[PDB]
Design an enzyme around this catalytic site. Structure first.
Site, PDB file in Angstrom:
ATOM      1  N   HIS A  85      62.283 -19.753   1.142  1.00 21.94           N
ATOM      2  CA  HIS A  85      62.350 -18.353   0.718  1.00 21.94           C
ATOM      3  C   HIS A  85      61.109 -18.003  -0.074  1.00 21.94           C
ATOM      4  O   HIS A  85      60.612 -16.886   0.008  1.00 21.94           O
ATOM      5  CB  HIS A  85      63.594 -18.119  -0.144  1.00 21.94           C
ATOM      6  CG  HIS A  85      64.837 -18.669   0.469  1.00 21.94           C
ATOM      7  ND1 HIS A  85      65.470 -18.052   1.528  1.00 21.94           N
ATOM      8  CD2 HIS A  85      65.490 -19.833   0.265  1.00 21.94           C
ATOM      9  CE1 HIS A  85      66.455 -18.818   1.949  1.00 21.94           C
ATOM     10  NE2 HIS A  85      66.486 -19.910   1.198  1.00 21.94           N
TER      11      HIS A  85
ATOM     12  N   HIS B 277      58.461 -18.607  -9.726  1.00 23.81           N
ATOM     13  CA  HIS B 277      58.172 -18.393  -8.320  1.00 23.81           C
ATOM     14  C   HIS B 277      57.657 -16.974  -8.192  1.00 23.81           C
ATOM     15  O   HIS B 277      57.647 -16.223  -9.170  1.00 23.81           O
ATOM     16  CB  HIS B 277      59.441 -18.545  -7.475  1.00 23.81           C
ATOM     17  CG  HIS B 277      60.536 -17.597  -7.858  1.00 23.81           C
ATOM     18  ND1 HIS B 277      61.353 -17.805  -8.949  1.00 23.81           N
ATOM     19  CD2 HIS B 277      60.917 -16.414  -7.322  1.00 23.81           C
ATOM     20  CE1 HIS B 277      62.192 -16.790  -9.066  1.00 23.81           C
ATOM     21  NE2 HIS B 277      61.947 -15.932  -8.091  1.00 23.81           N
TER      22      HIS B 277
ATOM     23  N   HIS C  28      57.204 -13.350  -5.394  1.00 20.57           N
ATOM     24  CA  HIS C  28      57.709 -12.556  -4.281  1.00 20.57           C
ATOM     25  C   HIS C  28      56.447 -11.784  -3.918  1.00 20.57           C
ATOM     26  O   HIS C  28      55.790 -11.239  -4.803  1.00 20.57           O
ATOM     27  CB  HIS C  28      58.795 -11.579  -4.738  1.00 20.57           C
ATOM     28  CG  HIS C  28      60.022 -12.246  -5.271  1.00 20.57           C
ATOM     29  ND1 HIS C  28      61.064 -12.646  -4.463  1.00 20.57           N
ATOM     30  CD2 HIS C  28      60.365 -12.598  -6.532  1.00 20.57           C
ATOM     31  CE1 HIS C  28      61.998 -13.215  -5.206  1.00 20.57           C
ATOM     32  NE2 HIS C  28      61.598 -13.198  -6.464  1.00 20.57           N
TER      33      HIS C  28
ATOM     34  N   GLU D 272      59.222  -6.737  -6.390  1.00 16.38           N
ATOM     35  CA  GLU D 272      60.633  -6.401  -6.285  1.00 16.38           C
ATOM     36  C   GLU D 272      60.907  -5.205  -7.182  1.00 16.38           C
ATOM     37  O   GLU D 272      61.433  -4.195  -6.721  1.00 16.38           O
ATOM     38  CB  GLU D 272      61.492  -7.608  -6.661  1.00 16.38           C
ATOM     39  CG  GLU D 272      61.257  -8.782  -5.714  1.00 16.38           C
ATOM     40  CD  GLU D 272      62.415  -9.752  -5.682  1.00 16.38           C
ATOM     41  OE1 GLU D 272      62.748 -10.320  -6.742  1.00 16.38           O
ATOM     42  OE2 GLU D 272      62.992  -9.942  -4.590  1.00 16.38           O
TER      43      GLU D 272
ATOM     44  N   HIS E 187      58.095 -14.437 -11.257  1.00 13.79           N
ATOM     45  CA  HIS E 187      59.347 -14.565 -11.986  1.00 13.79           C
ATOM     46  C   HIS E 187      59.420 -15.911 -12.694  1.00 13.79           C
ATOM     47  O   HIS E 187      59.413 -16.960 -12.050  1.00 13.79           O
ATOM     48  CB  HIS E 187      60.539 -14.425 -11.027  1.00 13.79           C
ATOM     49  CG  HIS E 187      60.773 -13.024 -10.557  1.00 13.79           C
ATOM     50  ND1 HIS E 187      61.552 -12.723  -9.460  1.00 13.79           N
ATOM     51  CD2 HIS E 187      60.326 -11.839 -11.035  1.00 13.79           C
ATOM     52  CE1 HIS E 187      61.570 -11.415  -9.280  1.00 13.79           C
ATOM     53  NE2 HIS E 187      60.832 -10.855 -10.222  1.00 13.79           N
TER      54      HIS E 187
ATOM     55  N   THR F 155      67.649 -11.792  -7.901  1.00 12.33           N
ATOM     56  CA  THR F 155      67.303 -10.930  -6.773  1.00 12.33           C
ATOM     57  C   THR F 155      67.490 -11.606  -5.416  1.00 12.33           C
ATOM     58  O   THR F 155      67.222 -11.007  -4.372  1.00 12.33           O
ATOM     59  CB  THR F 155      65.865 -10.438  -6.884  1.00 12.33           C
ATOM     60  OG1 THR F 155      64.972 -11.547  -6.745  1.00 12.33           O
ATOM     61  CG2 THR F 155      65.648  -9.765  -8.230  1.00 12.33           C
ATOM     62  N   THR F 156      67.934 -12.857  -5.436  1.00 13.12           N
ATOM     63  CA  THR F 156      68.191 -13.591  -4.206  1.00 13.12           C
ATOM     64  C   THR F 156      69.624 -14.085  -4.277  1.00 13.12           C
ATOM     65  O   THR F 156      70.176 -14.255  -5.368  1.00 13.12           O
ATOM     66  CB  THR F 156      67.276 -14.831  -4.061  1.00 13.12           C
ATOM     67  OG1 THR F 156      67.614 -15.797  -5.063  1.00 13.12           O
ATOM     68  CG2 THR F 156      65.818 -14.445  -4.223  1.00 13.12           C
TER      69      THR F 156
HETATM   70  C1  LIG Z   1      72.270 -20.206  -9.034  1.00 11.35           C
HETATM   71  C2  LIG Z   1      71.534 -20.358  -7.727  1.00 11.35           C
HETATM   72  C3  LIG Z   1      70.021 -20.407  -7.840  1.00 11.35           C
HETATM   73  C4  LIG Z   1      69.393 -19.169  -8.434  1.00 11.35           C
HETATM   74  C5  LIG Z   1      67.907 -19.068  -8.215  1.00 11.35           C
HETATM   75  C6  LIG Z   1      67.208 -18.207  -9.240  1.00 11.35           C
HETATM   76  C7  LIG Z   1      65.804 -17.801  -8.859  1.00 11.35           C
HETATM   77  C8  LIG Z   1      65.725 -16.549  -7.997  1.00 11.35           C
HETATM   78  O1  LIG Z   1      66.222 -15.423  -8.805  1.00 11.35           O
HETATM   79  S1  LIG Z   1      65.204 -14.321  -9.318  1.00 11.35           S
HETATM   80  N1  LIG Z   1      64.366 -13.855  -8.061  1.00 11.35           N
HETATM   81  O2  LIG Z   1      64.341 -14.940 -10.254  1.00 11.35           O
HETATM   82  O3  LIG Z   1      66.007 -13.237  -9.754  1.00 11.35           O
HETATM   83 ZN   LIG Z   2      62.401 -14.009  -8.098  1.00  5.38          ZN
END
Ligand SMILES: CCCCCCCCOS(N)(=O)=O
Ligand SMILES: [Zn+2]
Ligand SMILES: [Cl-]
EC number: 4.2.1.1
Length: 257
Positions: free
Chosen positions: A62, A92, A94, A104, A117, A196-197
């Site tokens: 992803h 990570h 996006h 995002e 993020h 967000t995922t």
């Molecule tokens: C609890 C399952 C794994 C969660 C992964 C978190 C990272 C992705 O989220 S974000 N994009 O930072 O809002």
């Molecule tokens: Zn993220």
């Protein structure tokens, strides 16, 4: 048929396996700068990454995660809208297929080329697992990326990407200092939201910095050479791995400035 960012498994399909996708505090959201209100009750934000210790980088199909050793009190985020201390676990990005999109969160509907993020979990909950079961279990520091001058501190990440081109691949990535990814100002907007995922859990206090960092066209172009697919599968470039803005609903975005 795993979730993704394609036409048949993208953001508009997530609600089926993850009903909370249509919840009351989903992320990301558009940040209407004129409607955001300065909040005097916010304490100074503190980003202490001096003792941060990265372990490795991974392509999870992803995006790619630079994970940190969070077994000790190191690399912490506190102050601002946060109560207590939050520990850095990973970061990570996006990004888009074109410089005109990729972020995002958006600012007055403006989409940046990418968004960083930095994920932290509330230390009062013991660890990340237990934290994602709480309304205030996580704090994500979001930083926008625009294309312009290169960001020296990002190159180490850019150069290791060749070794984790496909889903499932990971590589040693120690001694990376996340301080090299921060903009000068810590002015920010904050609001209660979610991951967000998928699983899109609503355990996040979002802290989005106003000042974006600049990265070179060459640096983001390398992000785009990554693959969503696993090794030996038809190549599908890892681009546009961002979720669009969601309904603000019963929420107010506060400004630290
Ligand atoms: C609890 C399952 C794994 C969660 C992964 C978190 C990272 C992705 O989220 S974000 N994009 O930072 O809002
Ligand atoms: Zn993220
Ligand atoms: Cl596709």
């Amino acid at each position: 048929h795993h979730w993704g960012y394609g036409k048949h498994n993208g953001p508009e399909h997530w609600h089926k396996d993850f009903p909370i996708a249509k919840g009351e505090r989903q992320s990301p959201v558009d940040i209407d700068t004129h409607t955001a209100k300065y909040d005097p009750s916010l304490k100074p934000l503190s980003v202490s990454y001096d003792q941060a210790t990265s372990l490795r980088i991974l392509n999870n199909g992803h995006a790619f995660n630079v994970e940190f050793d969070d077994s000790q009190d190191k690399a912490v985020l506190k102050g601002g809208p946060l109560d207590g201390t939050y520990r850095l676990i990973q970061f990570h990005f996006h990004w888009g297929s074109l410089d005109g999109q990729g972020s995002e969160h958006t600012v007055d509907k403006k989409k940046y080329a990418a968004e960083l993020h930095l994920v932290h979990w509330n230390t009062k909950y013991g660890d990340f697992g237990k934290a994602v079961q709480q309304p205030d279990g996580l704090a994500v520091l979001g930083i926008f990326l625009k294309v312009g001058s290169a960001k020296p501190g990002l190159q180490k990440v850019v150069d290791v990407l060749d070794s984790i081109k496909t889903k499932g691949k990971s590589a040693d990535f120690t001694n990376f200092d996340p301080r090299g990814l921060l903009p000068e100002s810590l002015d920010y907007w904050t609001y209660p939201g979610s991951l967000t995922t998928p699983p899109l859990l609503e355990c996040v206090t979002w802290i989005v910095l106003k000042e974006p960092i600049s990265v070179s066209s060459e640096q983001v172009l390398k992000f785009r050479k990554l693959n969503f697919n696993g090794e030996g599968e038809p190549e599908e470039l890892m681009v546009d791995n961002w979720r669009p803005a969601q309904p603000l609903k019963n929420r107010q975005i506060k400004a630290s400035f």
